[PDB]
């Protein structure tokens, strides 16, 4: 519309703004003052129609976002780069007989040692710039400015948790879709059939069986067997919310919950699995709209002409931009009746959060300091534990 209001014309006069004094190397020095009227507009009180509108409160809403897999996180010393692991293969006890060659007492019997070698993690970073002169214009107390400087920092702590939780639930779906053997994969037909298969596959763990681990794709576990058991204190179902609302809605969940394990807290579920994307073709960055889209989510370091390798992850919705279409797929389970029952010790996850406040660079030209947050996180998944995937594929 259009407004011929005496106060709205004063409001919309942008040549008087504070931004004019900070986007020009020479600017206005002394203030004459302004006539402020609250008549026949908003901000109008019944008494004293000539005062400036005043703030009752300003409220920093700071939500503590949590990583649900944080109790799995071991902490290492960030030294070397290859973590390896190994088991001892089964040798079943044999009957003894007193009528043998009796120089087989001299014979040897070594253990057999299935292993697997893991690479490194990656170091991740994020920064935030806080200045000292222009952000003071909009808090009216020192306490609100310090709460702002602290809320920015705790948001930078919280989105690390969001990143790591979304990253690990992308790992556990990428694993089961692509890398997992089709011996651990059971196939369902309908939702009640899948519920009965999930509830019999929980009970297919806690059993001394060499059938449910992928020790055959360890380095030395191709011949022989390796028997794994799993308690119920370390079994986790990873599924969707539309299917957790059906698994918990059965009488078997009630008899698990009564006098026993908390079955609500062993079923880790999400809305539908995957907001994380993968790169399949090594592309480059060509357009400024994609650069600004990456700047919106805090990715400051990437510029035009940067190449993205095959297998890089993004952790937000990227596939709508012109040069990402086709080059980028999604870690999303096919035929969303989906449940992946694992032992929680299979997630080999360790970090290094020792010294993640690197000391600030001041930049006293603009008086805008910068704090960086560096952390090393190693995400892997071990083959020596019971895993079952129940899909319709």
């Amino acid at each position: 519309q259009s407004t011929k209001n005496e106060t709205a014309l004063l409001v919309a006069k942008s040549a008087k703004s504070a931004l004019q004094d900070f986007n020009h190397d020479y600017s206005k020095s002394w203030t004459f003052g302004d006539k402020w009227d609250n008549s026949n507009t908003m901000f109008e009180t019944f008494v004293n129609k000539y005062l400036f509108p005043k703030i009752n409160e300003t409220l920093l809403i700071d939500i503590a976002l949590g990583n649900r897999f944080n109790w799995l996180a071991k902490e290492q010393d960030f030294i070397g780069q290859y973590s390896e692991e190994y088991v001892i293969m089964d040798t079943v006890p044999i009957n003894m007989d007193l009528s043998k060659n009796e120089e087989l007492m001299l014979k040897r019997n070594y253990p057999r040692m299935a292993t697997k070698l893991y690479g490194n993690g990656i170091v991740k970073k994020q920064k935030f710039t806080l200045n000292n002169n222009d952000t003071r214009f909009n808090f009216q107390t020192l306490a609100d400015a310090t709460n702002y400087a602290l809320g920015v920092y705790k948001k930078k702590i919280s989105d690390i948790n969001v990143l790591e939780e979304k990253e690990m639930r992308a790992m556990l779906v990428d694993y089961s879709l692509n890398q997992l053997s089709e011996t651990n994969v059971r196939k369902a037909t309908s939702k009640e059939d899948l519920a009965s298969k999930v509830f019999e596959a929980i009970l297919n763990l806690q059993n001394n069986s060499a059938k449910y681990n992928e020790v055959h794709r360890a380095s030395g576990g191709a011949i022989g067997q390796y028997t794994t058991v799993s308690k119920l204190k370390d079994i986790v179902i990873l599924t969707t919310d539309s299917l957790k609302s059906y698994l918990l809605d059965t009488k078997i969940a009630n008899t698990f919950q009564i006098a026993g394990i908390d079955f609500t807290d062993h079923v880790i579920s999400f809305d539908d699995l995957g907001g994380v994307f993968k790169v399949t073709k090594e592309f480059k960055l060509q357009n400024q709209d994609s650069i600004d889209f990456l700047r919106a989510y805090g990715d400051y370091q990437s510029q035009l002409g940067d190449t993205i390798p095959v297998g890089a992850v993004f952790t937000y919705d990227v596939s709508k931009l012109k040069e990402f279409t086709g080059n980028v797929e999604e870690i999303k389970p096919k035929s969303d009746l989906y449940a992946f029952i694992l032992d929680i010790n299979s997630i080999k996850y360790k970090r290094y959060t020792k010294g993640m406040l690197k000391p600030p660079f001041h930049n006293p030209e603009f008086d805008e300091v910068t704090h960086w947050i560096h952390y090393y996180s190693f995400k892997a998944i071990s083959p020596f534990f019971n895993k079952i995937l129940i899909t319709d594929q």
Binding site: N70, W71, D77, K354, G355, M356, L357
Partner: peptide, 27 residues
């Protein structure tokens, strides 16, 4: 093992690793 002047400026203390104080929020 050999120290000489081992605890020198910021990097010689940065490998003698520093201040596990802030960890991530859940546990």
């Amino acid at each position: 093992m050999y120290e000489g002047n081992n605890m020198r400026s910021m990097m010689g203390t940065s490998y003698e690793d520093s201040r596990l104080n802030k960890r991530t929020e859940l546990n």
